[PDB]
Amino acid sequence: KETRDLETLSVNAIRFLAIDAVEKARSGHPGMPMGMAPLAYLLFREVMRHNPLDPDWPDRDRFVLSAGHGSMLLYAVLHLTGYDLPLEELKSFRQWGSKTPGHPERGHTPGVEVTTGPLGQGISTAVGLALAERKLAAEFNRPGHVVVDHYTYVLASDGDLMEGVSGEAASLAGHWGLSKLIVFWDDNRISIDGPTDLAFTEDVLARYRAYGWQTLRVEDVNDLEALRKAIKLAKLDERPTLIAVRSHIGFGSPKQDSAKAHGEPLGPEAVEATRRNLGWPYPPFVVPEEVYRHMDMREKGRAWQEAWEKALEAYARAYPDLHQELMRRLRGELPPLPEEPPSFDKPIATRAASGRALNLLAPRLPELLGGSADLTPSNNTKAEGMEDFSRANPLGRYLHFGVREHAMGAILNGLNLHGGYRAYGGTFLVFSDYMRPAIRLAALMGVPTVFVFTHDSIALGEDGPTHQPVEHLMSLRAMPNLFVIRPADAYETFYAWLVALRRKEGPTALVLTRQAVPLLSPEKARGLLRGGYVLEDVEEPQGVLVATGSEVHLALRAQALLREKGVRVRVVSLPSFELFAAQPEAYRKEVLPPGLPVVAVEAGASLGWERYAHKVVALDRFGASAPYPEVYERLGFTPERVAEAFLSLV
Amino acid sequence: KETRDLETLSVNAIRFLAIDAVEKARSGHPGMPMGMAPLAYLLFREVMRHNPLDPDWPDRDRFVLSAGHGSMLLYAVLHLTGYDLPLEELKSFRQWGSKTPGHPERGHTPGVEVTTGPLGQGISTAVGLALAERKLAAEFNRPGHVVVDHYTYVLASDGDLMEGVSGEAASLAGHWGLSKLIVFWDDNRISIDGPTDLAFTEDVLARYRAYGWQTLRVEDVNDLEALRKAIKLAKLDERPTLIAVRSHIGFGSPKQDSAKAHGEPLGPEAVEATRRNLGWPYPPFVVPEEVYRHMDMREKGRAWQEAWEKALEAYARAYPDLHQELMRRLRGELPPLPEEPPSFDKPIATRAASGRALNLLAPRLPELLGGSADLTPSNNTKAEGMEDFSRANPLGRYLHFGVREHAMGAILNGLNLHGGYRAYGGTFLVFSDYMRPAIRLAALMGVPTVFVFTHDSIALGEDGPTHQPVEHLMSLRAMPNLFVIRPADAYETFYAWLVALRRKEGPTALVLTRQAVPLLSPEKARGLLRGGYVLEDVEEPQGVLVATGSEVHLALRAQALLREKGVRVRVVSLPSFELFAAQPEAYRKEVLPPGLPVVAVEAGASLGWERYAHKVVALDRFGASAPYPEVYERLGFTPERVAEAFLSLV
Ligand SMILES: Cc1ncc(C[n+]2csc(CCOP(=O)(O)OP(=O)(O)O)c2C)c(N)n1
Ligand SMILES: Cc1ncc(C[n+]2csc(CCOP(=O)(O)OP(=O)(O)O)c2C)c(N)n1
Ligand SMILES: O=C[C@H](O)[C@H](O)COP(=O)(O)O
Ligand SMILES: O=C[C@H](O)[C@H](O)COP(=O)(O)O
Ligand SMILES: [Ca+2]
Ligand SMILES: [Ca+2]
């Protein structure tokens, strides 16, 4: 009972830090932290190997709070176990510049593994964390040298399990046999609209059995013994595990078992009452020294990390090439990259050119993982050399995501968050729409996921409007911290991949054609590193045709038609708005000199082009089911129309 | 043995019309139509009640080809049953201007119910088709008077069942008990990447049994007797049913059971071999007259619809007032609406004002269905007077979608496609990312779904950057056939609802604040009907501040601040770019006079604003976890910054 009272005292410390931080914020989510405090205690005190002195210890267990809104459950337990998150920060919950924002932000807060809040993201991203551990183990572990051994734990809510992304990621996690992925579902029967049976009465655990997961239940979150056994059962199981954990939202309070406990402060009366009923004499933010001493993990984590650093030293003597590769990949250091593009002798789609860049890049990047959402032949994403990942071939660097763009987004982000890997995945640009939240989350975390988007335009032909992008380019360019690179040709494509791989600040979208487009010169194309450049200049420019991707070739043809009539325009290739806007003002004015009229050409939405052009040849309607180039021409992409657009400015 | 031969011969007409249409186009998807010919035969010939002569018959059975790549399956059987789809349109498969586009397009081919091609969308929209049939049947059917009674049939591929959206919608269909939804799954063990066990080994029917669906297998699609059984088992059952129908892709060709049969024409060799292995003598696009007269459905069609018209006259006699409302609703005629907004006395959030407009609007609109993806308390989407739809209360006008924004999108599209309902659903603007493909699909189809989006900016405060939109406005505005209306205040908000309810051509997104903003003059706010308008003019203006939603109030504060320094600017309110652009040039140039410098203010990305302003006060970064107004102010939305930006032009 001194063990039980210290457990109870410690669990309540978690409960009241959350209650009071929400109370003093007058904003946040107290209900779920109150019910799940016992699971937070058990993971951070007993189950997880982690180190509060070094959150980036590569061999730590990873905890993902997919149920983001319960941020204070995570802040309380980080604080209590000795992570560098002072009490003053928990008193600054949801305040400007605090390390305790409303939802967990990876990079903002020590020990936060994934930016959560958008439901389905945490639990889906966690599939990549665990795929990354499995594969890295397969690559590096040897007899008597186990340098990769950690689990991926997740706390998810009713919301997480309703989002279709979580089901897609569960299908793949089970298909892949990720034995070391352990998800806790807070089964507390309450959602924002009230009781879950308003909207959610499926047999959740039967669904997860069908995906090939183990399911377990724990009838009371407060029964630590029942949590301990379930966890041991999950680790013995070769399958990913879903542990349904029954809890009371607002546990211990007069808002217990109510949706009123979910998303607003308890109120002074209800905080007081919770204190009565849980036997908590301590005032706001005060926790006794007993609990600090019991919860301190600074020493157990020094011991754990030190034990791992020492196994690395034995690894480094027994296998020094393997050791230098792991250390290089864990630090995210790229090896030297080719300076010379592949050799192209004829017209080729930028998809096929992208395939050729990957044939050159993959054999020198064992970290580079690739895949597609069931478009491998159409996307050119399986490099020469790569084999399929499966349970039977855990060394395969090529991922068959199936028709699951969103969870592919989430799993790429997780593969890229883990350490050891750089991951890219493919689909048609139109189907970026199915993964938007995973794209935004990568830009928010600053995770450099590479999203490959082929079939960039109406030029794709007969598949027609449901497949032909229009708004997509401008919709992705408006997103903060996403480079959007639309190479004009096979050569630009090679430089686009160098830009993507070297860019670590956030994601890159590479935008590629289905149809064949001519070659530029490799020396001219290199200009892509500046995001925009003068491709074909002239004596005393009367104007500029500015263009992206396939439309640069339209522009060059319009340059000729105009030159024949004594009008002289230069052609600028703007493969990336973002990399161009990062250039010195002096370089941007050399390229697009003020006072010169400019026409933009791009087979997408006009909205945005006025930033650079006076007139745009663009597409502000949906496409059509017809062959290329007919579809392209009849929808107004001819060199005659670009020419006429330029003549209307002079 | 000679009905067995008319079946085989009809089934093969479907097969060969598809094969030859793909082979002549030299583009498209022959495999699935080959495998699934038998089911298309059975549905159009025997099972479905439909009228080739009136595809708009309100009480027809609805068929949704979710696996829209198999378009030649639908085009073949529509032709053979005497829909207005000539042999010449089959010969123009995927050619410019044809009635046979690569993927099925609602409103472009007689008898096509839903624009499909983006996998997940068909099977998901079908839940809205069924919910509409079920609700309208409950609202209008009377003892002796069955005026609503049809089934919603769906054909879905592997791809449809891997997409998270199809899971969300199956969860909701099972929860609602949509007895008359029947889904056939082409369980053909092939996908584009190769065998389905590359990425898809879940027990699909166990998952659907966990959603509370009935599941059935047909071991062979050619066994029409098996198919007849399954479909009768489905209709007897009160659950939605999924019928796994095993088929060989490329049935009868040397490309049978190969991914090579999926998405390319067979070629001559395999076309020629396939006529042999199935013994099909008739040359390309020749069907024997024996098959046209067997399959001709006009007679049976006319009789089914005459029966229903008779039941309607009987209904008009027995229930005059109900009949009048039903006819008005099926035709999508609006009844008269209030022309003056609710009365407002205090600063209020446009989410709350939206709530107050719906309290006013809904009692006059029995066709109006409301809902939220588990944010009913935060979206103000439950009108006073609405009750929860459930299996037990089918007359409820309010839909709890749970955390299923994507499936909500699809289901609102289904509701609004079916006839008799106008359906809207709410979530936070940031979560439009989860439902994008269904927003896009509304815009492609011209289906006037109304998407309610609250928490439109960093102004929402503490919930932080994962909840705060940035890119979303311009990302939506870029999409063709989408009105994006960001009303400035309580009064603008009422006129936005009028615009959205009166817009029939396509979807509308209403964008609302969490935080309260002041009231404008009721009579001024009427300007919203023109997209943009002068809110506060001045004498001989030296410039314009143009703004949308909340930032209108920021622009008036900056107007006043500029007057204090002897600088006069006019404030324009641009609640909708698309309604402004639709105004005559002369009105546009009245509102924004050429030559006058223009500073724009919007708490979202800059990209696009160059279309109207010379400077923009915008947000081109993610948000922060902090309270309003502080978070709004420190991220640069103050009257001092807007004024500063104007004076940097003057
Ligand atoms: C994708 C997404 N859609 C909507 C929301 C808005 N939202 C915040 S919390 C929540 C539901 C939370 O309910 P549950 O997951 O059961 O939480 P608990 O009862 O465990 O506190 C919703 C709809 C969100 N965070 N993410
Ligand atoms: C959302 C979405 N992602 C990707 C595609 C591209 N695509 C077309 S069909 C298909 C999958 C083909 O497999 P399945 O759906 O089982 O079709 P079948 O082999 O039966 O023809 C893919 C990836 C799509 N149409 N929609
Ligand atoms: O839609 C699915 C098809 O497999 C895909 O569209 C094939 O197209 P491709 O010839 O453009 O690779
Ligand atoms: O948990 C969910 C959100 O924090 C909540 O819905 C926001 O509530 P509000 O309506 O006060 O913005
Ligand atoms: Ca819950
Ligand atoms: Ca298939």
Side-chain angles (χ1 to χ4, degrees):
Chain A
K1 192 164 129 58
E2 256 282 292
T3 273
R4 307 266 281 104
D5 286 349
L6 205 33
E7 285 176 357
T8 296
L9 205 51
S10 286
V11 166
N12 280 321
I14 297 172
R15 285 202 180 107
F16 280 95
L17 279 182
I19 289 165
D20 301 331
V22 173
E23 199 60 43
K24 172 179 198 311
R26 306 209 305 111
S27 184
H29 299 74
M32 177 269 269
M34 281 156 88
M36 288 320 297
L39 165 73
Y41 168 83
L42 186 61
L43 283 168
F44 279 80
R45 178 65 182 78
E46 284 187 38
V47 166
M48 293 199 281
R49 302 187 321 192
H50 56 115
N51 186 353
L53 284 337
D54 190 17
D56 300 305
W57 168 37
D59 203 55
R60 67 188 193 283
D61 297 335
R62 262 81 176 175
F63 171 76
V64 188
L65 184 70
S66 196
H69 62 267
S71 51
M72 267 306 307
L73 174 61
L74 180 56
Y75 302 151
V77 86
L78 289 171
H79 170 83
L80 281 172
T81 56
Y83 285 82
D84 175 30
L85 185 64
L87 199 64
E88 185 49 50
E89 284 299 354
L90 314 191
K91 300 173 160 207
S92 289
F93 180 53
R94 279 176 164 255
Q95 308 306 306
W96 175 268
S98 87
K99 297 194 170 181
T100 61
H103 292 84
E105 294 177 29
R106 186 262 181 180
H108 211 307
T109 313
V112 167
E113 292 292 357
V114 179
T115 292
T116 65
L119 290 165
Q121 290 313 312
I123 188 188
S124 301
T125 308
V127 170
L129 293 178
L131 171 61
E133 187 277 346
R134 166 87 171 96
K135 283 194 51 54
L136 205 52
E139 271 187 83
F140 287 99
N141 286 354
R142 292 300 182 276
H145 307 249
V146 166
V147 296
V148 174
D149 179 22
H150 51 269
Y151 292 88
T152 308
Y153 296 99
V154 188
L155 172 53
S157 74
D158 296 322
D160 284 300
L161 305 186
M162 277 180 257
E163 280 298 350
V165 64
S166 76
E168 292 170 13
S171 205
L172 282 173
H175 174 68
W176 289 339
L178 302 179
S179 64
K180 304 174 84 184
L181 176 51
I182 303 194
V183 174
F184 301 88
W185 166 41
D186 185 0
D187 175 15
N188 63 18
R189 307 295 158 71
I190 290 300
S191 88
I192 285 176
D193 279 12
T196 51
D197 53 23
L198 292 169
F200 191 48
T201 57
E202 55 170 80
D203 188 343
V204 180
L205 297 181
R207 181 154 59 83
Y208 270 78
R209 287 190 297 272
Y211 296 135
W213 290 49
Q214 171 188 36
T215 56
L216 301 172
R217 309 126 97 269
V218 166
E219 307 213 270
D220 193 353
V221 71
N222 297 352
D223 174 358
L224 299 195
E225 201 47 37
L227 290 175
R228 292 181 183 106
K229 285 184 194 159
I231 294 187
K232 213 189 209 95
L233 290 171
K235 297 173 158 194
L236 284 161
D237 198 294
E238 73 279 4
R239 295 167 294 175
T241 311
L242 183 51
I243 299 164
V245 181
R246 189 100 183 269
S247 100
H248 304 279
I249 191 162
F251 173 76
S253 86
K255 297 196 198 168
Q256 186 175 296
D257 294 309
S258 165
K260 278 191 140 196
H262 166 85
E264 58 183 297
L266 286 193
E269 279 209 328
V271 166
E272 189 58 23
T274 310
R275 279 188 151 81
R276 286 182 183 103
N277 294 300
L278 286 186
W280 187 257
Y282 305 106
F285 300 111
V286 178
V287 173
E289 216 60 50
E290 212 177 352
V291 168
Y292 279 111
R293 271 206 328 284
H294 173 54
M295 293 297 297
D296 192 338
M297 297 279 102
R298 283 131 73 198
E299 300 164 327
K300 300 181 75 120
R302 185 175 286 100
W304 279 317
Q305 188 162 3
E306 184 50 63
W308 183 72
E309 267 160 13
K310 201 139 283 164
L312 267 179
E313 273 173 34
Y315 195 56
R317 276 152 8 219
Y319 294 96
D321 294 315
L322 284 194
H323 175 88
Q324 157 236 52
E325 265 300 287
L326 184 71
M327 289 301 101
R328 172 189 67 79
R329 285 161 58 170
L330 288 177
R331 301 199 197 93
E333 333 191 44
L334 279 177
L337 299 175
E339 309 208 301
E340 186 173 314
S343 260
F344 293 95
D345 57 10
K346 61 210 210 186
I348 192 160
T350 56
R351 67 162 165 173
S354 171
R356 288 269 295 286
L358 284 171
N359 290 345
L360 180 74
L361 289 154
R364 3 200 329 170
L365 289 168
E367 63 263 46
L368 192 62
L369 308 177
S372 181
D374 200 36
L375 285 180
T376 295
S378 288
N379 298 345
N380 298 87
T381 38
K382 190 171 187 170
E384 201 66 33
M386 294 178 168
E387 306 312 315
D388 303 354
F389 175 79
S390 59
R391 312 150 67 138
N393 194 244
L395 282 190
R397 308 185 148 86
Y398 195 71
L399 295 162
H400 290 281
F401 289 103
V403 186
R404 306 186 186 87
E405 298 80 16
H406 195 174
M408 174 176 81
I411 298 161
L412 285 178
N413 292 339
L415 281 178
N416 289 122
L417 271 171
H418 188 265
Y421 288 120
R422 192 73 189 274
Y424 70 87
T427 185
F428 295 166
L429 175 58
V430 62
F431 299 141
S432 57
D433 281 337
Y434 278 80
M435 50 167 102
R436 276 201 79 97
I439 308 184
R440 196 182 206 246
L441 202 74
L444 272 154
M445 299 191 284
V447 166
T449 298
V450 181
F451 297 99
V452 183
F453 298 125
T454 77
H455 293 56
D456 76 333
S457 101
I458 48 160
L460 69 77
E462 289 94 326
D463 276 345
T466 67
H467 286 58
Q468 288 152 351
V470 181
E471 63 280 19
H472 293 77
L473 279 169
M474 295 302 193
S475 96
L476 288 164
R477 279 166 184 149
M479 178 185 304
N481 191 29
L482 174 68
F483 275 29
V484 172
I485 317 180
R486 190 178 185 227
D489 82 328
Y491 292 119
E492 276 207 3
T493 304
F494 167 66
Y495 295 108
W497 266 108
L498 293 199
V499 173
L501 293 169
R502 286 196 232 111
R503 161 166 162 83
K504 315 312 201 68
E505 288 76 20
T508 301
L510 288 179
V511 181
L512 306 178
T513 68
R514 175 193 191 235
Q515 78 282 11
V517 293
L519 306 173
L520 301 190
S521 85
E523 287 80 27
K524 283 298 174 52
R526 174 176 237 288
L528 180 148
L529 299 182
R530 316 297 309 265
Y533 66 103
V534 190
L535 173 57
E536 276 300 329
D537 206 352
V538 298
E539 305 282 279
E540 276 153 293
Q542 291 161 330
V544 188
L545 311 183
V546 55
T548 71
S550 53
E551 278 65 74
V552 170
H553 302 103
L554 197 61
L556 286 169
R557 290 163 66 211
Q559 183 178 222
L561 289 183
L562 291 178
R563 187 253 305 123
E564 186 181 33
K565 298 192 165 184
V567 184
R568 299 181 309 287
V569 305
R570 64 156 67 152
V571 178
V572 168
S573 178
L574 190 51
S576 169
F577 281 33
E578 311 73 39
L579 180 55
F580 182 57
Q583 304 299 309
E585 198 174 288
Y587 173 76
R588 283 147 42 214
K589 281 181 187 190
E590 298 171 37
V591 175
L592 299 170
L596 279 195
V598 184
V599 173
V601 204
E602 167 172 274
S606 48
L607 188 56
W609 269 115
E610 307 91 351
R611 173 171 295 177
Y612 294 119
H614 297 88
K615 187 149 286 161
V616 334
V617 181
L619 186 65
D620 283 312
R621 48 153 293 173
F622 294 116
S625 177
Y628 173 85
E630 191 199 344
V631 67
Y632 187 77
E633 295 178 293
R634 303 186 88 165
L635 290 180
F637 294 99
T638 73
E640 292 72 19
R641 290 212 10 181
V642 171
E644 293 159 316
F646 186 77
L647 289 184
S648 84
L649 295 180
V650 295
Chain B
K1 183 267 141 91
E2 275 280 67
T3 323
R4 309 302 245 88
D5 286 20
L6 224 45
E7 277 167 356
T8 295
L9 204 74
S10 295
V11 161
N12 273 25
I14 292 169
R15 289 211 184 87
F16 277 99
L17 276 182
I19 292 149
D20 290 327
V22 187
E23 190 76 18
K24 186 169 194 279
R26 316 230 299 177
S27 170
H29 299 80
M32 180 274 262
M34 284 145 94
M36 293 304 297
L39 171 66
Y41 176 74
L42 196 76
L43 281 165
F44 283 73
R45 187 46 178 96
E46 319 189 0
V47 173
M48 266 165 43
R49 299 200 312 182
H50 60 112
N51 190 0
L53 294 175
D54 191 7
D56 300 301
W57 172 31
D59 213 42
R60 66 194 185 283
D61 285 335
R62 269 74 169 176
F63 178 72
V64 183
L65 185 56
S66 196
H69 55 272
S71 44
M72 258 331 296
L73 190 81
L74 185 50
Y75 298 161
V77 78
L78 289 179
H79 173 65
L80 288 183
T81 61
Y83 283 81
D84 177 16
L85 188 56
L87 189 59
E88 177 66 26
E89 293 299 339
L90 307 205
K91 292 186 184 178
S92 317
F93 186 46
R94 281 168 170 253
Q95 303 317 294
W96 177 275
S98 97
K99 287 196 146 168
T100 53
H103 290 96
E105 299 177 22
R106 202 282 207 144
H108 242 273
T109 314
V112 170
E113 298 292 343
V114 187
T115 298
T116 70
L119 286 161
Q121 290 312 314
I123 179 174
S124 291
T125 304
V127 171
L129 286 177
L131 176 52
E133 190 282 355
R134 168 98 187 73
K135 285 191 40 65
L136 195 63
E139 251 187 297
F140 282 102
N141 284 340
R142 287 289 178 282
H145 290 269
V146 175
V147 311
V148 184
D149 181 11
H150 49 278
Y151 291 79
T152 307
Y153 300 93
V154 181
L155 168 60
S157 66
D158 290 336
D160 283 307
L161 296 201
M162 291 183 255
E163 284 291 359
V165 63
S166 76
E168 289 180 8
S171 179
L172 269 178
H175 176 68
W176 291 331
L178 298 187
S179 39
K180 301 171 93 185
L181 181 53
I182 298 182
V183 183
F184 309 94
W185 156 44
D186 179 19
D187 169 17
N188 78 6
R189 312 294 162 75
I190 285 287
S191 80
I192 282 166
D193 266 23
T196 60
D197 57 37
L198 286 168
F200 190 40
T201 55
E202 58 171 85
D203 175 348
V204 179
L205 298 195
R207 175 153 68 82
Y208 270 73
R209 275 194 307 283
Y211 294 135
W213 292 48
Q214 165 176 67
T215 66
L216 303 163
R217 330 155 78 196
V218 170
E219 221 60 80
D220 193 337
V221 65
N222 296 334
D223 199 326
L224 286 160
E225 202 41 51
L227 281 173
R228 285 174 197 108
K229 254 66 164 206
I231 296 181
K232 196 183 194 179
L233 295 175
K235 286 192 169 156
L236 291 148
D237 205 288
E238 78 294 17
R239 302 166 292 164
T241 310
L242 175 62
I243 309 184
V245 174
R246 187 107 190 251
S247 117
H248 304 284
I249 207 192
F251 180 68
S253 75
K255 291 183 189 201
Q256 177 164 323
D257 291 316
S258 196
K260 249 63 206 209
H262 162 81
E264 70 178 13
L266 292 185
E269 319 104 294
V271 166
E272 171 57 57
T274 310
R275 284 178 145 78
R276 293 201 240 95
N277 303 328
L278 290 181
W280 177 261
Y282 312 94
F285 305 98
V286 173
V287 168
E289 196 59 26
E290 260 171 5
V291 177
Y292 283 98
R293 275 187 312 257
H294 175 54
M295 299 285 314
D296 184 334
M297 283 305 117
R298 287 105 140 175
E299 290 261 330
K300 296 163 87 91
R302 201 211 310 97
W304 286 319
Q305 171 159 17
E306 170 56 29
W308 177 80
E309 223 78 24
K310 202 150 279 151
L312 249 216
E313 287 174 312
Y315 193 68
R317 276 186 259 99
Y319 294 105
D321 286 319
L322 296 197
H323 175 94
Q324 172 162 16
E325 271 293 294
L326 179 53
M327 288 289 84
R328 176 185 66 67
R329 281 174 57 179
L330 288 177
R331 290 210 210 83
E333 289 147 42
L334 279 176
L337 298 174
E339 311 159 49
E340 39 277 348
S343 173
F344 294 101
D345 53 344
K346 289 197 284 267
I348 196 181
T350 61
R351 63 175 174 165
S354 170
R356 294 268 302 283
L358 279 172
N359 291 348
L360 193 53
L361 285 173
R364 288 225 191 161
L365 284 163
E367 60 270 42
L368 194 76
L369 309 181
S372 194
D374 199 45
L375 287 178
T376 299
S378 299
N379 292 339
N380 302 79
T381 46
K382 201 168 192 194
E384 238 139 48
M386 288 184 157
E387 310 286 17
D388 299 344
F389 169 90
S390 54
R391 63 212 319 155
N393 186 206
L395 303 177
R397 289 204 166 83
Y398 191 80
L399 294 163
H400 290 274
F401 285 96
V403 202
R404 305 184 184 96
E405 302 87 5
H406 202 166
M408 173 166 78
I411 291 154
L412 290 168
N413 286 346
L415 286 180
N416 279 129
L417 274 159
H418 179 275
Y421 287 115
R422 196 62 188 280
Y424 68 87
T427 184
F428 296 167
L429 178 61
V430 69
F431 301 138
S432 42
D433 292 335
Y434 277 75
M435 74 175 90
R436 191 107 182 166
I439 303 182
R440 193 170 205 254
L441 207 71
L444 282 144
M445 280 182 309
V447 173
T449 303
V450 178
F451 297 96
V452 178
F453 294 129
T454 74
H455 298 55
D456 74 325
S457 93
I458 54 184
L460 72 79
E462 288 91 332
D463 263 358
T466 69
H467 287 45
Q468 291 154 339
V470 183
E471 61 283 18
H472 296 73
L473 285 170
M474 295 297 196
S475 105
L476 287 172
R477 280 171 190 142
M479 178 188 296
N481 198 29
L482 181 53
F483 267 25
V484 182
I485 319 175
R486 200 191 176 214
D489 82 330
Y491 293 113
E492 278 207 8
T493 302
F494 165 85
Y495 292 111
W497 267 117
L498 284 189
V499 171
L501 290 168
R502 299 197 235 96
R503 161 172 160 78
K504 295 313 162 52
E505 312 81 48
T508 298
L510 300 188
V511 184
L512 315 171
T513 63
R514 191 196 176 221
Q515 75 292 1
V517 297
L519 307 177
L520 309 177
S521 146
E523 184 52 346
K524 281 303 185 63
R526 198 166 215 285
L528 181 139
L529 294 181
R530 299 277 262 153
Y533 67 100
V534 186
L535 173 65
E536 263 304 290
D537 213 357
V538 296
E539 300 259 85
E540 276 152 359
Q542 311 170 261
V544 189
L545 315 168
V546 59
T548 72
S550 48
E551 279 61 81
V552 172
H553 306 115
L554 182 40
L556 296 158
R557 284 168 71 216
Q559 178 173 231
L561 212 81
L562 285 174
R563 188 92 110 87
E564 168 182 325
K565 321 198 160 156
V567 179
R568 317 177 300 285
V569 301
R570 72 145 72 154
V571 169
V572 169
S573 180
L574 187 54
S576 164
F577 279 37
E578 314 75 36
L579 181 59
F580 187 55
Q583 307 313 295
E585 185 162 27
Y587 180 79
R588 295 199 310 273
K589 283 151 93 110
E590 264 173 59
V591 173
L592 297 168
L596 289 182
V598 177
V599 171
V601 196
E602 179 170 89
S606 47
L607 179 57
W609 270 111
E610 302 91 0
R611 174 166 300 181
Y612 294 121
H614 302 100
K615 196 142 293 185
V616 50
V617 176
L619 192 58
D620 283 315
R621 46 158 292 177
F622 298 123
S625 191
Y628 179 82
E630 178 186 5
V631 59
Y632 184 75
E633 283 174 338
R634 305 198 122 106
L635 291 170
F637 295 89
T638 65
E640 299 70 21
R641 294 287 185 195
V642 172
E644 264 200 347
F646 190 74
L647 294 168
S648 70
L649 311 181
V650 77

